[PDB]
Design a protein around this ligand. Structure first.
Ligand SMILES: Cn1ncc2c(N)nc(-c3cccnc3)nc21
Length: 274
């Protein structure tokens, strides 16, 4: 009902539309509140004719995001709910979604930069797992990137999938597909997919395979191969995330530690397949 970051609409200047989201436009804007310096924000607006259900679904993202505070989790800067249009303001992420940012920059960041991106994502997920929050839709298209290449987890919501939007099959652990048991360990499977997306500069997981083909292949022991030039130690970490037995997967603290070791010992990334 009441949001801790409700903000006066006169503190918001909406500037250009920069994207399209689930419920409407996403805009760049400026937030200037009394006693505070002006900051850049992204602004999601809910416009026109919408159900009350849609309004609650839209605002639920702000409710959840506002529970979190971490450098690798998108920060909620405020909401406008006492007036129309309804708005969610977040920190602005100059480079947008990670998957499209990497496709635009194919081959143009080094392995150590890519590992730093993956470390930031893993740190955000380490925090969510410690908060007992299961993301369920962890994918490169849900990671946002700032000007300094800091990656932050976005897309928050506790609504059930249609089977319980649809389950994102290509990112989802097999026990979550089969039994609808979503845990931080299923999040780890998804994180392995994100690693593959990052090291492939935004290629689509499983290329042209259908959803049922992916489900069957995973059950039949297929796993995505190392992306071109991918250090074998990073592919092995992906394979660890993709263990069928959820209890055998590394947990997020382990994943962060493994990436931190690579950053400290970059020579360990030189080994590549073939
Ligand atoms: C560029 N930027 N900066 C922050 C931000 C956000 N929270 N959400 C989105 C967003 C969300 C959904 C669809 N398109 C863009 N973009 C953002």
């Amino acid at each position: 009902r009441e949001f801790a970051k409700e903000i006066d609409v006169s503190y918001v200047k909406i500037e250009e539309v920069i994207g399209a989201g689930e419920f409407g436009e996403v805009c760049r804007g400026r937030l200037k509140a009394p006693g505070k310096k002006e900051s850049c924000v992204a602004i999601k607006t809910l416009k026109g004719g919408y159900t009350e259900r849609q309004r609650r679904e839209f605002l639920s993202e702000a409710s959840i995001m506002g529970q979190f505070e971490h450098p690798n989790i998108i920060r909620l800067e405020g909401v406008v709910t006492n007036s129309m249009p309804v708005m969610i303001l977040t920190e602005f992420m100059e480079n947008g979604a990670l998957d499209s940012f990497l496709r635009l920059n194919d081959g143009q960041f080094t392995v150590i930069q890519l590992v730093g991106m993956l470390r930031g994502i893993a740190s955000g997920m380490r925090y969510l797992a410690e908060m007992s929050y299961v993301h369920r839709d962890l994918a490169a298209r849900n990671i946002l990137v700032n000007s300094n290449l800091v990656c932050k987890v976005s897309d928050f919501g506790l609504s059930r999938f249609l089977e319980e939007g649809k389950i994102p099959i290509r990112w989802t652990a097999p026990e979550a597909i089969a039994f609808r048991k979503f845990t931080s360990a299923s999040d780890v499977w998804s994180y392995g997919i994100v690693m593959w997306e990052v090291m492939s500069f935004g290629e689509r997981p499983y290329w042209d395979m259908s959803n049922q083909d992916v489900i069957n292949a995973i059950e039949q022991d297929y796993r995505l191969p190392p992306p071109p030039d991918c250090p074998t130690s990073l592919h092995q970490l992906m394979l660890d995330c993709w263990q069928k037995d959820r209890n055998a997967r590394p947990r997020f603290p382990q994943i962060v530690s493994a990436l931190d070791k690579m950053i400290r010992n970059p020579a360990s990334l030189k080994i590549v397949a073939r």
